[PDB]
Short mmCIF file of C-alpha atoms in Angstrom, two decimals:
data_model
loop_
_atom_site.label_atom_id
_atom_site.label_comp_id
_atom_site.label_asym_id
_atom_site.label_seq_id
_atom_site.Cartn_x
_atom_site.Cartn_y
_atom_site.Cartn_z
CA UNK A 1100 -0.08 0.02 -0.04
CA UNK A 1101 1.26 3.50 -1.01
CA UNK A 1102 1.40 6.26 1.76
CA UNK A 1103 1.99 10.06 1.76
CA UNK A 1104 4.83 12.13 3.45
CA UNK A 1105 5.70 15.83 3.36
CA UNK A 1106 9.19 16.71 4.47
CA UNK A 1107 9.13 20.53 4.72
CA UNK A 1108 6.19 22.93 5.34
CA UNK A 1109 4.58 24.21 2.16
CA UNK A 1110 6.61 21.67 0.06
CA UNK A 1111 4.88 19.05 -2.14
CA UNK A 1112 3.59 15.80 -0.66
CA UNK A 1113 5.11 12.56 -1.98
CA UNK A 1114 3.35 9.09 -2.42
CA UNK A 1115 5.94 6.36 -1.65
CA UNK A 1116 5.79 2.56 -1.53
CA UNK A 1117 8.74 2.21 1.00
CA UNK A 1118 11.48 4.80 0.61
CA UNK A 1119 11.38 8.50 -0.40
CA UNK A 1120 14.95 8.66 -1.94
CA UNK A 1121 14.19 5.43 -3.89
CA UNK A 1122 11.08 7.00 -5.25
CA UNK A 1123 13.02 10.25 -6.24
CA UNK A 1124 16.25 8.87 -7.81
CA UNK A 1125 14.63 7.32 -10.95
CA UNK A 1126 12.79 10.63 -11.81
CA UNK A 1127 16.42 12.27 -12.18
CA UNK A 1128 17.20 10.09 -15.20
CA UNK A 1129 14.31 11.10 -17.56
CA UNK A 1130 16.27 13.93 -19.39
CA UNK A 1131 19.67 12.19 -19.94
CA UNK A 1132 20.56 14.16 -23.17
CA UNK A 1133 20.01 17.59 -21.43
CA UNK A 1134 21.15 16.90 -17.85
CA UNK A 1135 22.24 14.26 -15.20
CA UNK A 1136 22.13 14.46 -11.34
CA UNK A 1137 25.30 15.47 -9.43
CA UNK A 1138 25.22 14.32 -5.74
CA UNK A 1139 27.98 16.42 -4.12
CA UNK A 1140 31.59 16.16 -2.87
CA UNK A 1141 31.48 12.97 -0.79
CA UNK A 1142 29.41 11.27 -3.48
CA UNK A 1143 31.85 12.25 -6.33
CA UNK A 1144 34.86 10.96 -4.31
CA UNK A 1145 32.97 7.74 -3.31
CA UNK A 1146 31.97 7.19 -6.98
CA UNK A 1147 35.52 7.97 -8.19
CA UNK A 1148 37.20 5.56 -5.78
CA UNK A 1149 34.56 2.84 -6.38
CA UNK A 1150 35.39 3.07 -10.18
CA UNK A 1151 39.11 2.15 -9.21
CA UNK A 1152 38.18 -0.86 -6.86
CA UNK A 1153 39.09 -4.20 -8.41
CA UNK A 1154 36.14 -6.27 -6.96
CA UNK A 1155 33.56 -3.43 -7.63
CA UNK A 1156 30.40 -4.84 -9.26
CA UNK A 1157 30.22 -4.15 -12.96
CA UNK A 1158 26.45 -3.63 -12.76
CA UNK A 1159 27.17 -0.43 -10.69
CA UNK A 1160 29.69 1.01 -13.28
CA UNK A 1161 27.25 3.07 -15.59
CA UNK A 1162 28.38 6.01 -17.77
CA UNK A 1163 26.88 8.64 -15.43
CA UNK A 1164 29.62 7.82 -12.82
CA UNK A 1165 32.15 9.44 -15.24
CA UNK A 1166 29.98 12.55 -16.01
CA UNK A 1167 30.06 14.15 -12.43
CA UNK A 1168 26.95 11.98 -11.76
CA UNK A 1169 26.18 8.55 -10.51
CA UNK A 1170 24.32 5.78 -12.28
CA UNK A 1171 20.84 4.99 -11.03
CA UNK A 1172 21.96 1.54 -10.01
CA UNK A 1173 24.82 2.95 -7.91
CA UNK A 1174 22.69 5.68 -6.10
CA UNK A 1175 20.02 3.01 -5.51
CA UNK A 1176 22.66 0.55 -4.18
CA UNK A 1177 24.12 3.19 -1.95
CA UNK A 1178 20.73 4.33 -0.67
CA UNK A 1179 19.93 0.66 0.18
CA UNK A 1180 23.19 0.11 2.10
CA UNK A 1181 22.78 3.31 4.15
CA UNK A 1182 19.07 2.61 4.85
CA UNK A 1183 19.97 -0.91 6.13
CA UNK A 1184 22.70 0.22 8.57
CA UNK A 1185 20.49 -0.03 11.69
CA UNK A 1186 18.20 -2.81 10.39
CA UNK A 1187 18.30 -6.07 12.41
CA UNK A 1188 19.69 -8.73 10.05
CA UNK A 1189 18.12 -11.58 12.06
CA UNK A 1190 14.69 -12.63 13.27
CA UNK A 1191 14.35 -12.45 17.03
CA UNK A 1192 11.04 -12.40 19.00
CA UNK A 1193 12.84 -10.47 21.80
CA UNK A 1194 13.87 -7.64 19.38
CA UNK A 1195 12.15 -4.43 18.61
CA UNK A 1196 13.28 -2.11 15.72
CA UNK A 1197 15.84 0.60 16.94
CA UNK A 1198 13.07 3.17 16.26
CA UNK A 1199 10.44 1.53 18.52
CA UNK A 1200 13.07 0.96 21.31
CA UNK A 1201 13.86 4.71 21.34
CA UNK A 1202 10.15 5.59 21.31
CA UNK A 1203 9.45 3.39 24.28
CA UNK A 1204 12.46 4.85 26.11
CA UNK A 1205 11.38 8.53 25.34
CA UNK A 1206 7.64 7.98 26.26
CA UNK A 1207 8.68 6.36 29.56
CA UNK A 1208 10.91 9.34 30.47
CA UNK A 1209 8.24 11.90 29.43
CA UNK A 1210 5.67 10.00 31.51
CA UNK A 1211 7.91 9.87 34.62
CA UNK A 1212 8.74 13.57 34.49
CA UNK A 1213 5.09 14.67 33.94
CA UNK A 1214 3.37 11.98 36.04
CA UNK A 1215 1.06 11.17 33.03
CA UNK A 1216 -0.24 7.77 31.74
CA UNK A 1217 1.88 5.61 29.46
CA UNK A 1218 0.91 4.96 25.85
CA UNK A 1219 -1.02 1.71 25.16
CA UNK A 1220 -0.94 1.49 21.32
CA UNK A 1221 1.09 2.64 18.26
CA UNK A 1222 -0.78 5.97 17.59
CA UNK A 1223 -0.41 7.02 21.30
CA UNK A 1224 3.37 6.02 21.24
CA UNK A 1225 3.80 8.29 18.10
CA UNK A 1226 2.19 11.27 19.77
CA UNK A 1227 3.83 14.47 21.10
CA UNK A 1228 7.36 13.44 19.75
CA UNK A 1229 8.54 17.03 19.54
CA UNK A 1230 7.68 17.69 23.18
CA UNK A 1231 9.22 14.35 24.20
CA UNK A 1232 12.50 15.18 22.33
CA UNK A 1233 12.45 18.83 23.63
CA UNK A 1234 12.16 17.61 27.32
CA UNK A 1235 14.98 15.03 26.64
CA UNK A 1236 17.42 17.58 25.11
CA UNK A 1237 17.05 20.11 27.83
CA UNK A 1238 17.30 17.47 30.58
CA UNK A 1239 20.20 15.73 28.83
CA UNK A 1240 22.51 18.70 29.17
CA UNK A 1241 22.70 18.03 32.90
CA UNK A 1242 23.69 14.34 32.42
CA UNK A 1243 26.16 15.10 29.67
CA UNK A 1244 28.12 17.64 31.77
CA UNK A 1245 30.18 14.69 33.26
CA UNK A 1246 29.40 11.74 30.89
CA UNK A 1247 29.97 10.93 27.20
CA UNK A 1248 27.85 9.13 24.68
CA UNK A 1249 29.98 6.19 23.70
CA UNK A 1250 29.67 2.57 25.04
CA UNK A 1251 32.47 0.81 26.78
CA UNK A 1252 32.78 -2.12 24.32
CA UNK A 1253 34.48 -5.60 24.46
CA UNK A 1254 34.64 -7.08 20.86
CA UNK A 1255 33.03 -5.75 17.69
CA UNK A 1256 29.90 -8.00 18.03
CA UNK A 1257 26.62 -6.08 18.47
CA UNK A 1258 24.73 -8.66 20.69
CA UNK A 1259 25.31 -9.21 24.42
CA UNK A 1260 26.65 -12.48 25.97
CA UNK A 1261 24.36 -15.55 26.69
CA UNK A 1262 21.92 -14.23 29.28
CA UNK A 1263 21.22 -10.88 27.63
CA UNK A 1264 23.68 -8.65 29.42
CA UNK A 1265 26.67 -6.68 28.17
CA UNK A 1266 29.71 -6.10 30.46
CA UNK A 1267 28.80 -4.45 33.81
CA UNK A 1268 30.56 -1.19 32.65
CA UNK A 1269 29.08 -1.07 29.17
CA UNK A 1270 26.47 1.70 29.79
CA UNK A 1271 28.20 3.12 32.97
CA UNK A 1272 29.64 6.22 31.26
CA UNK A 1273 26.73 6.83 28.88
CA UNK A 1274 24.81 10.25 29.53
CA UNK A 1275 21.50 9.02 28.24
CA UNK A 1276 21.57 5.79 30.35
CA UNK A 1277 22.63 7.82 33.37
CA UNK A 1278 19.67 10.33 32.82
CA UNK A 1279 17.24 7.39 32.68
CA UNK A 1280 18.69 5.79 35.90
CA UNK A 1281 18.34 9.13 37.78
CA UNK A 1282 14.68 9.08 36.89
CA UNK A 1283 14.24 5.57 38.21
CA UNK A 1284 14.19 3.81 34.87
CA UNK A 1285 15.93 0.48 34.04
CA UNK A 1286 16.08 -0.69 37.64
CA UNK A 1287 17.47 -4.11 38.54
CA UNK A 1288 17.91 -6.65 41.41
CA UNK A 1289 21.10 -4.77 42.49
CA UNK A 1290 19.73 -1.23 42.04
CA UNK A 1291 20.27 0.87 45.19
CA UNK A 1292 16.95 2.89 45.17
CA UNK A 1293 13.51 1.44 45.97
CA UNK A 1294 12.46 0.21 42.45
CA UNK A 1295 9.72 2.29 40.61
CA UNK A 1296 7.44 0.67 37.99
CA UNK A 1297 9.32 -0.31 34.76
CA UNK A 1298 7.41 2.07 32.39
CA UNK A 1299 9.37 0.81 29.42
CA UNK A 1300 8.18 -2.82 30.01
CA UNK A 1301 4.63 -1.58 30.62
CA UNK A 1302 4.76 0.12 27.22
CA UNK A 1303 6.26 -2.83 25.40
CA UNK A 1304 3.80 -5.28 26.97
CA UNK A 1305 0.83 -3.04 25.87
CA UNK A 1306 1.99 -2.22 22.36
CA UNK A 1307 4.12 -5.18 21.26
CA UNK A 1308 3.39 -8.04 23.73
CA UNK A 1309 5.15 -10.42 26.17
CA UNK A 1310 8.07 -11.52 23.95
CA UNK A 1311 9.98 -8.12 24.59
CA UNK A 1312 11.98 -8.66 27.75
CA UNK A 1313 12.88 -5.77 30.26
CA UNK A 1314 15.53 -3.51 28.62
CA UNK A 1315 17.76 -4.00 31.66
CA UNK A 1316 17.47 -7.83 31.36
CA UNK A 1317 17.77 -8.16 27.63
CA UNK A 1318 20.09 -5.17 26.84
CA UNK A 1319 20.23 -5.46 23.00
CA UNK A 1320 16.99 -3.30 22.90
CA UNK A 1321 18.59 -0.77 25.30
CA UNK A 1322 21.80 -0.50 23.30
CA UNK A 1323 19.76 -0.16 20.01
CA UNK A 1324 17.17 2.25 21.42
CA UNK A 1325 19.78 4.51 22.97
CA UNK A 1326 21.66 4.95 19.62
CA UNK A 1327 18.32 5.53 17.67
CA UNK A 1328 17.46 8.15 20.37
CA UNK A 1329 20.91 9.82 19.88
CA UNK A 1330 19.96 10.02 16.10
CA UNK A 1331 16.68 11.73 16.95
CA UNK A 1332 18.59 14.26 19.39
CA UNK A 1333 21.16 14.91 16.65
CA UNK A 1334 18.31 15.60 14.12
CA UNK A 1335 16.71 18.00 16.76
CA UNK A 1336 20.06 19.80 17.21
CA UNK A 1337 20.83 20.04 13.47
CA UNK A 1338 17.43 21.69 12.74
CA UNK A 1339 17.75 24.10 15.79
CA UNK A 1340 19.22 32.04 2.52
CA UNK A 1341 20.25 30.28 -0.81
CA UNK A 1342 19.74 26.54 -0.98
CA UNK A 1343 21.30 23.66 -2.99
CA UNK A 1344 18.10 21.59 -3.41
CA UNK A 1345 15.77 22.87 -6.12
CA UNK A 1346 12.83 20.41 -6.49
CA UNK A 1347 11.32 22.47 -9.45
CA UNK A 1348 14.42 22.24 -11.46
CA UNK A 1349 14.95 18.47 -10.68
CA UNK A 1350 11.41 17.12 -10.93
CA UNK A 1351 9.33 19.77 -12.75
CA UNK A 1352 7.50 23.17 -11.98
CA UNK A 1353 4.56 21.25 -10.46
CA UNK A 1354 6.85 20.44 -7.45
CA UNK A 1355 9.24 24.26 14.05
CA UNK A 1356 10.92 22.47 11.03
CA UNK A 1357 11.56 19.53 13.47
CA UNK A 1358 7.83 19.27 14.57
CA UNK A 1359 6.57 19.44 10.93
CA UNK A 1360 9.10 16.63 9.91
CA UNK A 1361 7.74 14.54 12.82
CA UNK A 1362 4.13 14.98 11.98
CA UNK A 1363 4.22 14.81 8.26
CA UNK A 1364 7.09 12.49 7.58
CA UNK A 1365 8.12 10.32 10.69
CA UNK A 1366 4.49 9.64 12.08
CA UNK A 1367 2.94 8.70 8.64
CA UNK A 1368 5.98 6.47 7.91
CA UNK A 1369 5.70 4.43 11.20
CA UNK A 1370 1.78 4.31 11.01
CA UNK A 1371 2.01 2.66 7.59
CA UNK A 1372 5.52 0.87 8.06
CA UNK A 1373 5.88 0.26 11.85
CA UNK A 1374 9.21 -1.77 11.59
CA UNK A 1375 11.07 1.07 9.80
CA UNK A 1376 14.63 1.40 11.29
CA UNK A 1377 16.18 4.74 12.08
CA UNK A 1378 18.82 4.68 9.27
CA UNK A 1379 15.91 4.03 6.79
CA UNK A 1380 13.99 7.09 8.22
CA UNK A 1381 17.12 9.33 8.21
CA UNK A 1382 19.89 7.94 6.01
CA UNK A 1383 21.63 11.24 5.81
CA UNK A 1384 22.08 11.39 9.64
CA UNK A 1385 23.95 8.03 9.45
CA UNK A 1386 26.43 9.46 6.77
CA UNK A 1387 27.13 12.39 9.14
CA UNK A 1388 27.76 9.87 11.91
CA UNK A 1389 30.04 7.85 9.61
CA UNK A 1390 31.93 11.05 8.72
CA UNK A 1391 32.64 11.83 12.43
CA UNK A 1392 33.36 8.11 13.44
CA UNK A 1393 37.09 8.92 13.99
CA UNK A 1394 36.26 11.93 16.12
CA UNK A 1395 37.90 14.30 13.57
CA UNK A 1396 36.98 16.10 10.26
CA UNK A 1397 40.61 16.50 8.93
CA UNK A 1398 41.00 15.31 5.27
CA UNK A 1399 43.32 12.57 6.62
CA UNK A 1400 40.64 11.26 8.97
CA UNK A 1401 37.99 11.78 6.29
CA UNK A 1402 40.18 9.78 3.65
CA UNK A 1403 40.64 6.83 6.12
CA UNK A 1404 36.90 6.75 6.85
CA UNK A 1405 36.19 6.94 3.15
CA UNK A 1406 38.53 3.95 2.39
CA UNK A 1407 36.95 1.95 5.22
CA UNK A 1408 33.44 2.62 4.03
CA UNK A 1409 34.23 1.78 0.37
CA UNK A 1410 35.69 -1.53 1.31
CA UNK A 1411 32.52 -2.27 3.44
CA UNK A 1412 30.26 -1.10 0.55
CA UNK A 1413 32.23 -3.39 -1.81
CA UNK A 1414 31.67 -6.43 0.53
CA UNK A 1415 27.94 -5.66 1.00
CA UNK A 1416 27.18 -5.40 -2.77
CA UNK A 1417 29.16 -8.55 -3.80
CA UNK A 1418 27.50 -11.33 -5.79
CA UNK A 1419 29.90 -14.20 -5.33
CA UNK A 1420 29.21 -17.60 -3.83
CA UNK A 1421 29.00 -14.96 4.85
CA UNK A 1422 30.95 -14.25 8.07
CA UNK A 1423 32.89 -11.51 6.20
CA UNK A 1424 29.48 -9.95 5.23
CA UNK A 1425 28.22 -10.02 8.73
CA UNK A 1426 31.52 -8.40 9.89
CA UNK A 1427 31.04 -5.64 7.37
CA UNK A 1428 27.46 -4.91 8.41
CA UNK A 1429 28.38 -4.89 12.10
CA UNK A 1430 31.49 -2.68 11.38
CA UNK A 1431 29.39 -0.03 9.49
CA UNK A 1432 26.78 -0.10 12.29
CA UNK A 1433 29.33 0.23 15.13
CA UNK A 1434 31.23 3.10 13.17
CA UNK A 1435 27.90 5.03 12.97
CA UNK A 1436 27.27 4.44 16.73
CA UNK A 1437 30.73 5.77 17.51
CA UNK A 1438 30.21 8.75 15.17
CA UNK A 1439 26.83 9.52 16.77
CA UNK A 1440 28.50 9.53 20.32
CA UNK A 1441 31.32 11.64 18.97
CA UNK A 1442 29.01 14.33 17.52
CA UNK A 1443 27.15 14.55 20.87
CA UNK A 1444 30.48 14.74 22.72
CA UNK A 1445 31.56 17.81 20.74
CA UNK A 1446 31.15 21.46 22.27
CA UNK A 1447 28.45 22.32 19.67
CA UNK A 1448 26.97 19.15 18.00
CA UNK A 1449 24.75 21.37 15.68
CA UNK A 1450 27.87 23.49 14.45
CA UNK A 1451 30.03 20.32 13.97
CA UNK A 1452 27.27 18.68 11.93
CA UNK A 1453 26.51 21.98 9.95
CA UNK A 1454 30.32 22.23 9.15
CA UNK A 1455 30.42 18.60 7.90
CA UNK A 1456 27.17 18.67 5.85
CA UNK A 1457 28.23 21.89 4.12
CA UNK A 1458 31.77 20.50 3.27
CA UNK A 1459 30.87 16.94 2.35
CA UNK A 1460 27.30 17.34 1.04
CA UNK A 1461 27.09 21.05 0.18
CA UNK A 1462 23.85 21.60 2.20
CA UNK A 1463 23.47 25.48 2.59
CA UNK A 1464 20.52 25.94 5.05
CA UNK A 1465 17.85 24.19 7.16
CA UNK A 1466 15.81 23.36 4.06
CA UNK A 1467 18.83 21.39 2.70
CA UNK A 1468 19.60 19.83 6.18
CA UNK A 1469 16.08 18.24 6.40
CA UNK A 1470 16.12 16.84 2.88
CA UNK A 1471 19.65 15.59 3.26
CA UNK A 1472 18.68 13.69 6.44
CA UNK A 1473 15.63 12.01 4.65
CA UNK A 1474 17.33 11.32 1.16
CA UNK A 1475 21.03 10.81 1.94
CA UNK A 1476 22.09 13.12 -0.83
CA UNK A 1477 21.30 16.61 -2.36
CA UNK A 1478 21.23 16.23 -6.13
CA UNK A 1479 21.73 19.12 -8.51
CA UNK A 1480 21.28 19.25 -12.33
CA UNK A 1481 24.52 19.16 -14.43
CA UNK A 1482 24.39 19.79 -18.17
CA UNK A 1483 25.40 16.91 -20.49
CA UNK A 1484 28.11 18.18 -22.76
#
């Protein structure tokens, strides 16, 4: 079933089957003798280095790659890889999508701070997202004064040990985990305070059922939800005169900012596609996270990141007759988690993100930032000569 989304106020509405950028990209190849789409600096270097890789799939080597453009197959493949970064590759009854885990965590916190009832279904869980994020961003400043946003990891595997728990110190130095603990959330058998009701479990039991265990007992949903929540906070901070993206020129003359995006893009997407993962909602945010995964934006650090991503992309798009593939998916996901924590640890997350998005993706204002987050690229028309 097709559904409708609007990304920016006053802008046209789009009817999509699953992904907005996947709906847009084919429309940019209907005037190939007049113009081709150009996707920006990071995309041109990525395409250029992919055309030099020995193992690079031949199906993604179209002529457009050499005309300051990308072939439709290559931009589609890249959009797919980025959208699948935070997607669970396995089936597990205990697992929620990262998006739903973040939504349960943020609704529990909002309920505890305002002494208001918990949501009991999907539409209530999707309500007042802007106020929930606003409360979380203002309260988080207190917790982030002495704590960072990166996990204390042991191995590059994403899942916890048999039993459901990570190492005792895994979440210890995380500001968002600490903020939830100060509010009485995620209590355990060894917690020092008199335990309050587990509001996250009451939400999961009501909306999803009995298969979702407590986040403190089966900690994969907590690791997953915390990083999806960091992505929503980074989106809030990024959106808080001339533009690169011109829809009239690309598609035809017929074609707060955060709150509008929530109500007209995020909420309609999750009502029609409830399992949508965070990197599929906001692929551009995951590219920004990948760019800051080393904790630096120097061309040396950017180059090393770009080499690492191109090798990962290469493995993910291979068609050759599986542990190497799993390792690559996990490595890309962990690099984005690291990048996300790094951005939030910077003095001004919004400024750091704005500097990166302007240099690597040529976004010029809030209009371009929102579209970059949803599409993963900001295409421009380039004349064919």
